[PDB]
Design a binder for this molecule. Structure first.
Ligand SMILES: [Ca+2]
Ligand SMILES: [Ca+2]
Ligand SMILES: [Ca+2]
Ligand SMILES: [Ca+2]
Ligand SMILES: [Ca+2]
Ligand SMILES: [Ca+2]
Lengths: 213, 213
């Protein structure tokens, strides 16, 4: 049997609802009056009534904005019943797919990441890793594509930029010489993760680095 | 059989082509690999290739902007063929409907309309009618809803506004007293027709009125 494998709808649509999706009918409507209905989660099962079909015209519609991160795909079936009460078609599968918008900020997996480094470590020495996740669609968009940056370093001594971060991996490394346990044993870095390859929604966390012998 | 009775597409779409319309598949694709194709005017018949279907995925797409005033409805059929060469579904009817944009200016049915009026006619006397048409969708929009106005009167004597026009019907009537064949035997009015109930696209024509005894 034929299936409508996808009718796409972006999440978070604005403007007037309901919105038309597609009109389906039985070509047996030349024989009898036919009445249309739909079943499935999103139709008669929870979330009830997100999708409706006009009983006489067969216009399938969506009645509220969708949310890809809650339900990304709805599987419905359309039904066609004559006025005398006989189903005149085998029910047809109709799938609604929800496309992504950038509506989730990245989140670091920890509020505070801890790491340590030997004071004599040569510039370039990898110290620790910070990590973030993003609930948006990393398959089809850059809405979940995170760039890591360092926002600040406390203290700014002996130099303001003792460390750097790999923009893609979140690995933090020694950038310059001068680390010294006896002068400054601890650094607090504010790190940022931002989606849209660093241009989008952002969040911060801390990396606390202990300088060892 | 089920029919996709309408997938709507506005005419004159901008941005990137091709544009996805709907994805259709055979659920017999669990048994065999299935290849999809479409037939109909707009697909394999003229205008060829305005609609295409991806042979493996079943994504039906439109490849160029549509024009409601040229073709307002396309009737396509989808086909599903196994890799061994057997049609695995009855072809399904899929109708694409083109929705309207206001892209046609009203047009008067004549460049010059002629009428006459007796000089003693009381104010309110109907003189003649001007008429315009509009190729846009008068059923579903106001894109063809015309308001008539008078733009100018030559000569502006004895008064600047000797006539008026019914905004809906285009009937021109005597507005005030003072018409006189021996003083001014002829008036040329520039008349305007504008769609969007007078707010939209506009055109002009002339109404030449002869004053009789
Ligand atoms: Ca969402
Ligand atoms: Ca995001
Ligand atoms: Ca999202
Ligand atoms: Ca047009
Ligand atoms: Ca128009
Ligand atoms: Ca039009």
């Amino acid at each position: 049997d034929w299936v409508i494998a996808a009718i796409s709808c972006p999440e978070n649509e604005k403007g007037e609802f309901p919105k038309n999706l597609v009109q389906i009918k039985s070509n047996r409507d030349k024989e009898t009056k036919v009445f249309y209905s739909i079943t499935g989660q999103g139709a008669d099962k929870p979330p009830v009534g997100v999708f409706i079909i006009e009983r006489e015209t067969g216009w399938l519609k969506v009645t509220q904005p969708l949310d890809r991160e809650a339900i990304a795909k709805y599987i419905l079936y359309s039904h066609a019943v004559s006025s005398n009460g006989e189903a005149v078609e085998d029910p047809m599968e109709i799938v609604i797919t929800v496309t992504d918008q950038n509506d989730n900020r990245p989140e670091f997996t920890q509020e505070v990441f801890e790491g340590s480094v030997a004071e004599g470590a040569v510039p370039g020495t990898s110290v620790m890793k910070v990590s973030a996740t993003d609930a948006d669609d990393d398959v089809n968009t850059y809405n979940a594509a995170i760039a890591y940056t360092i926002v600040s370093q406390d203290p700014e001594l002996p130099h303001k930029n003792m460390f750097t971060v790999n923009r893609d991996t979140g690995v933090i490394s020694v950038l310059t010489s001068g680390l010294d346990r006896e002068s400054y044993p601890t650094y607090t870095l504010v790190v940022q993760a931002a989606d849209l390859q660093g241009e989008g929604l952002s969040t911060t966390a801390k990396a606390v680095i202990t300088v060892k012998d």
